[model samples]
Target: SLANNIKKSTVIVKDPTHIAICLYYKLGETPLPLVIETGKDAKALQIIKLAELYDIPVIEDIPLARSLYKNIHKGQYITEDFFEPVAQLIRIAI
Candidate 1:
């Protein structure tokens, strides 16, 4: 039930081979880091597929994906450094 309780929207960022999935509950709430995964090829694609299965929105942003995968971990809330970009994506996802 990964999508359970997901009140608002989901945002996904993909680099060349890394993917980060973030979830938002409310406009003013911090985003929840859902997944930070890396793969040679298919794994990355699988992540996107999984997102699509849940109807989550996927966005391509190499720098943001790199920073998110490097700094954030699954189940952790994103730090302030990522607020602006994450907020922007959340708006787009919504």
Candidate 2:
């Protein structure tokens, strides 16, 4: 289960109409896969599997995801705001 590993958060960012970003988090440490175009269904599915296979959470916070998607770069850490929520999710998972 995703809660078991808790190393990442695979996110699906939407623009209130369509999927806008695809990001699988391992933030505050390493470079993550950040795709900023579209067609997130397939790729998002990939991360969802990774979330399952590797055991990490898939957080579907569209608004939060969008802002993180907008602010972050290809190899950048997702800032402090991202951590708190993730920390909360981690505790919940525990």
Candidate 3:
């Protein structure tokens, strides 16, 4: 299934305040922001729990999460400034 094939390449970023899910389709493609959940406390926990349940890899980078939460939107490709960090996460996920 395509979903099964896509699952391993997923990456999640979470901090105390926000969480974001990113999808990597192929080796040279930019990571896409799938979703971003933001709230006080419970939201972050819920995102991590969901990631664990789905067996998606989660990376805790407070600054990066904060930047993503503020700058990017769902379904949008991340910008050039974020390319390196997101690529690093994709490398780890695969």
Candidate 4:
């Protein structure tokens, strides 16, 4: 699963698309051999290896949420934007 606001980027799945946690939530139930996660680096090769060992399929939308642009273009809010927005969503007393 990807971040809540991660639908902006273009995504292409090379392998058979596996059900991710976020998508599972969107679909209203957990999928078997679950592997989709929230961290930007969760889709890294290492985790993929673990998933393979555990027979979990990797279904990531982005390799890295960090942007390649020096100045992000319009409509290109990456992970950084989500950080602040998520903070606002939190009802913390601190």
The best-first sequence of candidates by lDDT reads: 3, 1, 2, 4
RMSD of 1: 4.0
Residue 91 accuracy (lDDT) in model 1: 78
TM-score for each candidate, following the candidate numbering: 0.67, 0.44, 0.68, 0.24
For candidate 3, lDDT tens digit of each residue in 1-94? 3234225436777774455444544545534433333432665666566667788887878888878777776556778788888878767776
How much does each candidate deviate from the true structure in C-alpha RMSD? 4.0, 6.9, 4.5, 13.8
What ranking of all candidate models by TM-score puts the best one first?
Answer: 3, 1, 2, 4
lDDT of 2 by residue, 2-54 (tens): 23222334543444433334444445744534332232456445544545566
Alpha-carbon shift of residue 21 in model 3 (angstroms): 3.7
Which regions in candidate 2 have their CA more than 4 angstroms from the true location? 1-39, 80-83
- Give the residue spans of candidate 4 off by over 4 A: 1-43, 59-94
Clashing residue pair totals per candidate (backbone < 3 A): 0, 0, 0, 1
lDDT of 1 at 3: 44
